[PDB]
Amino acid sequence: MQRGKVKWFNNEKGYGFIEVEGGSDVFVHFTAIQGEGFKTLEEGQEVSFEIVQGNRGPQAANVVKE
Amino acid sequence: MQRGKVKWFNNEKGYGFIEVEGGSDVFVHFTAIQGEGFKTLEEGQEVSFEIVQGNRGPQAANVVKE
Ligand code: NA
């Protein structure tokens, strides 16, 4: 698990990228976002998350908004 | 039917969140807003609305400023 801050999120498309210290930006899809409510993120939002590797490459999992 | 006050609304992006007494904040997209005028909301505006569940989580529908 790592903390990061959303760099960009296209709310209409439902995906974006998370900046992290000491790694490349991480793709995040809305289906990774946990908890109550409509699955969305704003740029600048701080989250905790894990990275998983699929056929498309690394992406965020278990994204929890701070 | 619910009543709330807009907590924040990004006019450029066309979405925000409504605060409701005794529940979690509810996402609102501009396409939910009813009426003739440009589809926008100011923070503090009183609104009536319904909550619609869906794949990406709950959001407001039939939002009326009144
Ligand atoms: Na980085």
| Extents of the domains making up chain A | 1-66
In terms of CA atoms, which chain B residue is nearest residue A40? B56
In chain B the first and final C-alpha atoms are separated, in Å, by 13
- Give the span between the Cα atoms of A59 and A3, in whole angstroms: 14
At how many Å resolution was this determined?
A: 1.3
Residue B20 is encoded by which pair of tokens? 């409701």
Considering only CB atoms, A39 lies closest to which of B13, B25, B56, namely: B56
Considering only CB atoms, B59 lies closest to which of A14, A30, A38, namely: A38
In Å, what is the CA distance from B38 to each residue of A19, B6, B32? 35, 16, 12
* Among the listed residues A33, A3, A36, the one whose alpha carbon sits nearest the alpha carbon of residue A15: A33
Experimental technique, in short, is X-ray
**Coil, strand, or helix at residue A21?**
coil
CA atoms within 13 A of residue A49's CA, in its CB half-sphere = 29
H/E stretch holding B58 reads none
* Among the listed residues B54, B10, B52, A56, the one whose alpha carbon sits nearest the alpha carbon of residue A29: A56
Residue B56 is encoded by which pair of tokens? 């990406």
CATH number of this structure's domain B1-66, picked from the four choices 2.40.50.140, 2.60.40.3080, 3.40.50.300, 3.40.50.720: 2.40.50.140
